[PDB]
Design a binder for this molecule. Sequence first.
Ligand SMILES: [Cl-]
Lengths: 244, 240, 241, 235, 243, 231, 195, 250, 111
Amino acid sequence: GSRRYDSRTTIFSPEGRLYQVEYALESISHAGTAIGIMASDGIVLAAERKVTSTLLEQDTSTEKLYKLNDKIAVAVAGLTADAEILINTARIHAQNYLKTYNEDIPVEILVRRLSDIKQGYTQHGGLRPFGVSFIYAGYDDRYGYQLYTSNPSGNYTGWKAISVGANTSAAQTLLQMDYKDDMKVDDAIELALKTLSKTTDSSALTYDRLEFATIRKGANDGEVYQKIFKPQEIKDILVKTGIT
Amino acid sequence: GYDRALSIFSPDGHIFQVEYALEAVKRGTCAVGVKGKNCVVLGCERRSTLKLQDTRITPSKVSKIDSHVVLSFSGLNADSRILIEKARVEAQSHRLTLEDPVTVEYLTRYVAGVQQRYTQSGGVRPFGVSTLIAGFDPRDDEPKLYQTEPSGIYSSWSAQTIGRNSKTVREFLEKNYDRKEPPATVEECVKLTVRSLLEVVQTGAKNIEITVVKPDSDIVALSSEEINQYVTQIEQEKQE
Amino acid sequence: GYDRHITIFSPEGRLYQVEYAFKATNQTNINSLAVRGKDCTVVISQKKVPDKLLDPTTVSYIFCISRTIGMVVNGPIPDARNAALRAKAEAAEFRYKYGYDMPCDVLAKRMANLSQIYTQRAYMRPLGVILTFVSVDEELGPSIYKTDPAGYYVGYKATATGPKQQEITTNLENHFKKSKIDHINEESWEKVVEFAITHMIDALGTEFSKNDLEVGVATKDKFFTLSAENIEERLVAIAEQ
Amino acid sequence: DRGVSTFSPEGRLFQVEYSLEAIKLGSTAIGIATKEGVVLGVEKRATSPLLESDSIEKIVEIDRHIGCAMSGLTADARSMIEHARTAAVTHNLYYDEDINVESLTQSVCDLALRFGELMSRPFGVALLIAGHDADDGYQLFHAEPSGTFYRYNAKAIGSGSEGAQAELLNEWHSSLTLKEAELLVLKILKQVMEEKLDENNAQLSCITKQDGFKIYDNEKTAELIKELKEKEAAE
Amino acid sequence: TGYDLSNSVFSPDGRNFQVEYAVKAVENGTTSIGIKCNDGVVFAVEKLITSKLLVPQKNVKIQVVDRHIGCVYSGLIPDGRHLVNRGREEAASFKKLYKTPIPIPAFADRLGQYVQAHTLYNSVRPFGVSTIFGGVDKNGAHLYMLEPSGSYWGYKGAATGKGRQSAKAELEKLVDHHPEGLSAREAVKQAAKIIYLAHEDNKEKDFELEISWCSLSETNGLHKFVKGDLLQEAIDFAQKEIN
Amino acid sequence: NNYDGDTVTFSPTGRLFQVEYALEAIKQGSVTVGLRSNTHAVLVALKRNADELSSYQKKIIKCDEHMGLSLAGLAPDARVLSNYLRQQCNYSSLVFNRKLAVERAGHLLCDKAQKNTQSYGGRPYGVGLLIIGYDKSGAHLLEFQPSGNVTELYGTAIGARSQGAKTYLERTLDTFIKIDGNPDELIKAGVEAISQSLRDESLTVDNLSIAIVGKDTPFTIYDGEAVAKYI
Amino acid sequence: MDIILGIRVQDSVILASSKAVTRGISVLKDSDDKTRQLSPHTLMSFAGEAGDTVQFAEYIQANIQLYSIREDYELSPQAVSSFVRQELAKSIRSRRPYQVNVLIGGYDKKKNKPELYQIDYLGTKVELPYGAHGYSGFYTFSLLDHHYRPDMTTEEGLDLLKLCVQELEKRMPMDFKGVIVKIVDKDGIRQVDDF
Amino acid sequence: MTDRYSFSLTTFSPSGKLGQIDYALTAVKQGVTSLGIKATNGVVIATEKKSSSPLAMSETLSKVSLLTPDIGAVYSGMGPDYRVLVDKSRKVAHTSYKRIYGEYPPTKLLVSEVAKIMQEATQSGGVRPFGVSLLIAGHDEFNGFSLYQVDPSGSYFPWKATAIGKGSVAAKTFLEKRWNDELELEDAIHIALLTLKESVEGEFNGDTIELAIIGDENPDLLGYTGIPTDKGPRFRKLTSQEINDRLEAL
Amino acid sequence: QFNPYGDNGGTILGIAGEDFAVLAGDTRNITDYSINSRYEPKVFDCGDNIVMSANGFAADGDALVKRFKNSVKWYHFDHNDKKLSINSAARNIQHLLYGKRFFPYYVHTII
Ligand SMILES: [Cl-]
């Protein structure tokens, strides 16, 4: 019968590893780098677009940074199509919680459920896992500002600063070097850009090859604002820190 | 529905998928359980290749199943959430129908049964997780510590460890634990647990987690400084 | 190399099962041809009955799908009949649902879509057949639309299918270069059938008796097949000119 | 790979034959039937000294008149016992009587071949089912993952089975007392066990018409162990 | 290669090797035939007597569908029974909805589509039988032969099994020598002769003859078995021709 | 070789190896014999034990008051098939107030076994059956093979060394077929038949299993001291 | 079932619930507690169809306790009330709807404010300074409209509640065998034993 | 019987590649060239009509398809796969948008739905990925004109101008030299015809070229009058004659 | 509206002695004011020395007796020809009847 053509996506190696999960992580390591840095007064999300063409429409484009609700956003590394499947599920899950409890969903609860979906694809159903790693940046009134990451295994962890995708090893060393706890948002903006500028596989970091976003309490009194940076705003912030 | 029989017998009578799940447990961070005269202590290793962590929000290694029972594990972290969730739901369901919280033996028997089901069901792989389940039965002061593994077998232990280098710490416990006289106090039990982890860990800094469970839903997690005092005290007695 | 056993892509972006289904098409060693007149659409096919014990009247590769649509198949008879029964059911359902007769090109698209599914879904093999649909559509007039195991389909001025299809194709091409028009400029279907047989004789280089051929004709409001004697009458007319 | 329900060229089911190898790796279990009762005994075999041996549960009650011992992948036995208990209680509900020992065994054995591509694989555990009923008296059954069951006067399963069975062939007669059977299980267990037999690493049990199925205390078994050592030295 | 390990897989030729392998099982089976006649059809089959212990006349192989169709087959006998069971379901539902008993060409396609369906998926095995069948309907007599691929045609005479070539040759002579037609009673006698002649290809074990027929005049359009005096008469005719 | 992975695969010579391997399980089974006259039908079966401490595996099963069988091969498969026969015999009684013909019983078993040889995932039955019965057309004996093939006979045998009894019955055919109105003599002939398949072992009191059905006899099985008469 | 009341004051929510369980012409019990603790700072009282009441109450209790264990956190009274409303709003279009009316009294620890929610079996939720279900409201609402002030103490609230029970004991047709009174504040839930 | 293929036929290889997606992209590379250019007041999409036989009527085979009145699509790769995707794409524009909001979906969201369908053929049981890359041009009130590319993986990117298929590498370079942000629609049609001539080998006329625009509303193509707010489709397929007129002033 | 029940009349009576038991019943069967049969037995030997009658609606009565007779048959098949005791028969019949609690057998049963 059809047994002949079954890859058996949800089995263990003799060493106790999940073949498909390991190989999905290998795929992700070639995707454009994405960085998250958590400051005391906000969070920065920075990501490098995958080798751009000059005829790409840059302003009406979204590849790396996606909005989940008004208080939570994600940076993507991996297959974009796979990520959008998961993003729409996460968006719906957030609305279910709001409908049920009349309160915005706590960040960890959303992250756990999305990670639980990834886990299922590695234990049952005979399907390939999602080739995606997320950086979650969000705020709630329990833990304040939070950074998380999840990967195809469905395992998630919390961070002060973290990178996913390409050159994470080099990027993590640089973040570990210059990060300190009393850091502000504007300092974190600079650290995020400086790190990408040194770890990039490109010749020079320009406005057209970046996506940027901040989550501050820099609205008016006790409320959180999401700023997905426009092209010209990335051009200005790149000049303001003296990278171009 | 995906039907494939993934866990099957081999010519020598082994179920390799169950045995390979045990290798995933062997890769996981070390976990240890030690029960005293009036308490149980659960100790857990945390690897230090991860700096820049946020420990406020990162999932803790020891999980409360109910107010009187806790569960720690070794193996795949994602897999453990599924077992913990099912255990927490069964805990509330038992309170609802029997009008009494679960015994530690019952909660363990349930978790072990779930693990076994995943070894002879089509389309699923076994859990890459072994658990230590500890606590006190309702209106009882006798300490309880149980262990489960991917195959589904479970048993009670005076003290036990699982995870990477668990054979080294089990060796330590086998000569340092007297059945005739278990650690009489909380301090004694925590110390023997910290000692056993120090045989394997590295630095006694932000690498060791300790959770103490006492009778009648009395569970608390120690902080860095509190654990660091045990580390400091043990090293000074060692230089002799 | 299990990528050659089911319908998944090979490293060079090919579907071998689909390609091998195309080779099953010629397993019967029969050639077919279709042309359009002013008022009609004629399809002809070779009829080979090797066994003496066969009832020759039951040996056929032309099918009456609906009152208006006819279909000739190139490929093994089991798959041919499978396709025919489905086409009949589809055309009947269309009429019931939408209140008018299923057009030839729409049925072709639908059968092509079904074939496409077998090229994408693993558990279903492609049918080793090429289906040529003919009619006189009430909107588009005389029509020829052809389907293959890849799920491809297109309309035709005229067409041919089988092992010696290329010879017949170029023969027809050269005629339409000369005539400068899209069809056979003829009043009666009888002479369009005669044209079809004449040009098949020239291209294949063989003579036909009444039992070596099979003919289907589509006119306004009906498609019908010809008897042995209807073809014999047609063969006599060609010979006497 | 290959189908789970495939036959070998010799006419045997691969998966069933492979599960029989798993059972050979299991700890020893012995049963002896008398006219005064049926005795069941097992080797506990703790993997480490820190493990509390009394939590090792390899002898199990199905009903008051039926008991059970196991050997092999013992986790697989949980659902078999669950089914056996439900079968026994359900029959009592439907018929206001005790269910026959043979009928119980047949019900458990019906689960066995319900695997394929139903569960994904056969059971990796063999069962010794011992009980009493009014019709056929004291009985002992060996239930395999093949779906087959044999009645036995005496039977051993597990790693030390073939050696223990040969010993049971010589020792069993139709006039054995219950006490004689208890000692005989201890004697043969001590012979095939790796570690030295005592009250903590071996367990005895029995089923009698009068008192039903009883697992013995560690204190009661310890005295039978002492009575056994004294009798072997006495000639 | 490996193209022959799974059903429904095309080889580079455009062939389904699994079906061709099923044909080998048919060629291994005993001989069965069908003769079309003036107003009906006749069926016959070779039954190998494996042992003295077989009860004569009591292992019947020819099967009836509805009340007007007869079926015989060579190859895996159980596969043939499965096909007839489906045939009976198909014929029942036709008569249920349309009242009239199922026409033979209609019945032929019902079996054809069902057998063809068992060449579409790797999760089923092709049929290990060629089936000769037919009867009488509103348009007269029809004889059909269906093969593992799903292929079927109408036949003047049909044969399959180990002695198919011998039987085919004998059938072709009847078609040539009788262009106007063969009578029902004549066809029964000829069927006996042809089975005896086709038995030369299976002559270790001696055999038992079994005949059936449908005729508008002789059996009133219904399927009946040939027994007693008419059977012995047909056996004697066959015995006289081999010597 | 490459064509024995499952039942859904034909070999290049047109063989079904999984079905053949199932047939092999019958050959390893203990011998059982079946024979009949015009008034009665008898089953005789040699039972097999695990050792001297074990019981002897029961070979004969009752299906109805007028029907039953003996088995050789996988016993659980015989339980499944006998249970199906019990239901079919029962359906005929409840719905049509009709005792199920032994011939129909054969046709039903054939079609049940066949389905397991044409679909992916399944396996053939690994047991052979000898069905005896008395219905409206007198006494009957059937032989079931898990290939699907069912055959009606005067007498037969299946299992290990069944060829000895099968030859004997082939010689004795003219004698035992006319043992009408005499049960004990028809059994004696069946016991002598199964004796031609014995090696190193002889028929004992907890070894032999006999069953009989007939004109004025319901299907009944004899074991233990009730077969001592025939040794 | 029958009488359930609720009053929100400056620093606490007070729930009063009748003790009688009557079936036919017999008062089967006079000490029934028509309430369940959902969380340490959230209490729910209930009234309605026999069986349905306790089954629904305990089902909600199980769910909130499950949430508490999962997140190691206590849901706000507003969040719990919205969960309960939605469960009832689902129920009303089921094959057999829950015929249960509830009051939810809670103390929000993040806001340091008491909160009282009235929800009927249809899933109709309102936040109120004082609430009642069934025929009780026809007497107590007008009484509280007159005597209630928003800045009252817990003691003032209990006296205001005594005034309600007295009125009900005077003008209600049925003997409801008094009430069990419970207080919800910053320190959790406690029962007044002498009322 | 029944679909026993409940498992993925596209899986990760040790190197991290998804084989079937890569191989599908290879099928797209073999396919005939198609392109799209975005102007200030419109969008043009074009492709060559590769005829299978001169007896075939290439008008009956449409490579450029209307999805909504303001959205059109073209492809490179496998034709049959494209045809069923167009069917599914047209339906999903109704079921998951028009039947809910009473208006047609904006370009980006329809594209998003098509991408979802192609992603599922990459993960679901018993199926291979689609062997096509799509170019989708469209207009909507709040986003204006836009052009998108959708790949077998399910990924989509917005373009000012691009090409896919056989001679895409050369065609993309040609478009980089000619494209500016001040291009009027007629200028974009001119450049589209120039770019396509490079990749086409045989005949180059209105019968071998298929070209459609997304531009001004066409009231004459609406089919009815009387509703001021309904002004007609922005999608228009250029006729064979209209193409030849522009090939003279080339 | 269709009424699935009817009343076939008649009456039955059971008495027990020290070593015996009788189960009697009249042989008249009726609907409304008509006699259907003067001899239509409704007391049956069910095997294992158990006699049974289910009186009221005869269609339900026959169905029940039929099912119980069949239950005795399968009890033998499943439990090694063991005799079904009268107390066990009673408990089995309870489950037959209660199985149709929400669409009852309209009969008074005596064994
Ligand atoms: Cl379609």
